[PDB]
Design an enzyme around this catalytic site. Structure first.
Site, PDB file in Angstrom:
ATOM      1  N   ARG B   9      -7.170   4.342 -41.441  1.00 34.58           N
ATOM      2  CA  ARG B   9      -6.508   5.470 -42.100  1.00 34.58           C
ATOM      3  C   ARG B   9      -5.780   6.284 -41.018  1.00 34.58           C
ATOM      4  O   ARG B   9      -6.330   6.484 -39.942  1.00 34.58           O
ATOM      5  CB  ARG B   9      -7.490   6.324 -42.896  1.00 34.58           C
ATOM      6  CG  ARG B   9      -8.085   5.582 -44.083  1.00 34.58           C
ATOM      7  CD  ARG B   9      -9.028   6.484 -44.849  1.00 34.58           C
ATOM      8  NE  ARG B   9      -9.653   5.775 -45.965  1.00 34.58           N
ATOM      9  CZ  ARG B   9     -10.839   5.179 -45.908  1.00 34.58           C
ATOM     10  NH1 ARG B   9     -11.548   5.193 -44.780  1.00 34.58           N
ATOM     11  NH2 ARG B   9     -11.332   4.572 -46.981  1.00 34.58           N
ATOM     12  N   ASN B  60      -2.984   8.800 -46.636  1.00 34.81           N
ATOM     13  CA  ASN B  60      -3.288   9.588 -47.826  1.00 34.81           C
ATOM     14  C   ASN B  60      -2.431  10.842 -47.724  1.00 34.81           C
ATOM     15  O   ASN B  60      -2.520  11.568 -46.723  1.00 34.81           O
ATOM     16  CB  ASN B  60      -4.782   9.908 -47.929  1.00 34.81           C
ATOM     17  CG  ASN B  60      -5.607   8.666 -48.151  1.00 34.81           C
ATOM     18  OD1 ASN B  60      -5.532   8.018 -49.195  1.00 34.81           O
ATOM     19  ND2 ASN B  60      -6.321   8.243 -47.134  1.00 34.81           N
ATOM     20  N   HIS B  74     -12.508  -1.219 -31.704  1.00 32.38           N
ATOM     21  CA  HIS B  74     -11.102  -1.401 -31.346  1.00 32.38           C
ATOM     22  C   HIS B  74     -10.524  -2.636 -32.053  1.00 32.38           C
ATOM     23  O   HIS B  74     -11.249  -3.388 -32.707  1.00 32.38           O
ATOM     24  CB  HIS B  74     -10.977  -1.575 -29.799  1.00 32.38           C
ATOM     25  CG  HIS B  74     -11.813  -2.701 -29.233  1.00 32.38           C
ATOM     26  ND1 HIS B  74     -12.948  -2.452 -28.453  1.00 32.38           N
ATOM     27  CD2 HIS B  74     -11.622  -4.043 -29.305  1.00 32.38           C
ATOM     28  CE1 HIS B  74     -13.400  -3.638 -28.081  1.00 32.38           C
ATOM     29  NE2 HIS B  74     -12.649  -4.631 -28.592  1.00 32.38           N
ATOM     30  N   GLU B 122      -7.243  -2.920 -27.620  1.00 32.95           N
ATOM     31  CA  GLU B 122      -7.595  -3.721 -26.464  1.00 32.95           C
ATOM     32  C   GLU B 122      -6.520  -4.740 -26.128  1.00 32.95           C
ATOM     33  O   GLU B 122      -6.116  -5.539 -26.978  1.00 32.95           O
ATOM     34  CB  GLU B 122      -8.962  -4.373 -26.693  1.00 32.95           C
ATOM     35  CG  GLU B 122      -9.361  -5.371 -25.626  1.00 32.95           C
ATOM     36  CD  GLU B 122     -10.787  -5.834 -25.800  1.00 32.95           C
ATOM     37  OE1 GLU B 122     -11.103  -6.442 -26.848  1.00 32.95           O
ATOM     38  OE2 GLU B 122     -11.607  -5.527 -24.909  1.00 32.95           O
TER      39      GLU B 122
HETATM   40 ZN   LIG Z   1     -12.831  -6.681 -28.049  1.00 29.07          ZN
HETATM   41 ZN   LIG Z   2     -13.391  -6.349 -24.777  1.00 27.35          ZN
END
Ligand SMILES: [Zn+2]
Ligand SMILES: [Zn+2]
Ligand SMILES: [Cl-]
Ligand code: NI
Lengths: 128, 127
Positions: B9, B60, B74, B122
């Site tokens: 979100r 939203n 992540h 990442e």
């Molecule tokens: Zn990862």
């Molecule tokens: Zn990692």
């Protein structure tokens, strides 16, 4: 470029793995436990990591739990039949938060499960 | 069965799309207003949704922001040159953090991009 994985922190890795492998038919792609760092990672999914995005589950051996917020949404999975996956999830005693059916104003058959940690899993029936 | 998407979100859809398309070179694959629900959905990624999992962005209309928990980790992305993506994200004013000694990444120093909503990306160098 490609999307590799989404990472989620879990309180109990075994409970998390039981959910993804049994209720969702994912297989364990790769697991690494590091006594030196006191954490474990487990990559679950359907295809090899080289071929598709996977789910990364992180387990910090000394963290009992995590706080959920409202920023992270869900992981969506394509299923052949959403009612069948829900009934199978219920038989294993997993939480179905929204039973399979057409969503609000659409022709998409959707369902929602919650994993042991409270993470939302969106099921979308093949044909959408 | 296959993974379709991960959903996040976002407080400002335009700021978020600006980050994913310019900093990360993602394509805007699909975008749709849902007026009854008062939200908009955007799907960003590198391949067709039928072939690969994407990133779903939910905006939203009646929200200014979100409360982030500490469970969500992540989204990892494979890049041709991590140093180039890093230097590009910096030029655009996005935060880059780097971690050394992550035992799960051997001897690699891993860079993490921070999106407008504070979500971590990442960067994994292809190879
Ligand atoms: Zn990862
Ligand atoms: Zn990692
Ligand atoms: Cl634990
Ligand atoms: Ni979704």
């Amino acid at each position: 470029m490609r999307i590799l994985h989404s990472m989620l922190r879990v309180a109990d890795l075994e409970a998390a793995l039981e959910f993804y492998t049994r209720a969702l038919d994912m297989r364990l792609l790769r697991r690494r436990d590091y006594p030196e760092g006191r954490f474990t990672l487990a990559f679950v999914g359907y295809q090899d990591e080289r071929a598709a995005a996977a789910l990364e589950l992180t387990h910090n051996w000394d963290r009992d739990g995590y706080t959920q917020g409202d920023g992270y949404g869900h992981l969506a999975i394509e299923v052949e039949d959403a009612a069948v996956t829900c009934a199978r999830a219920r038989a294993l005693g997993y939480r179905v938060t929204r039973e399979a059916g057409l969503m609000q104003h659409g022709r998409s058959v959707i369902a929602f499960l919650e994993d042991p940690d409270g993470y939302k899993v969106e099921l979308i029936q093949k044909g959408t």
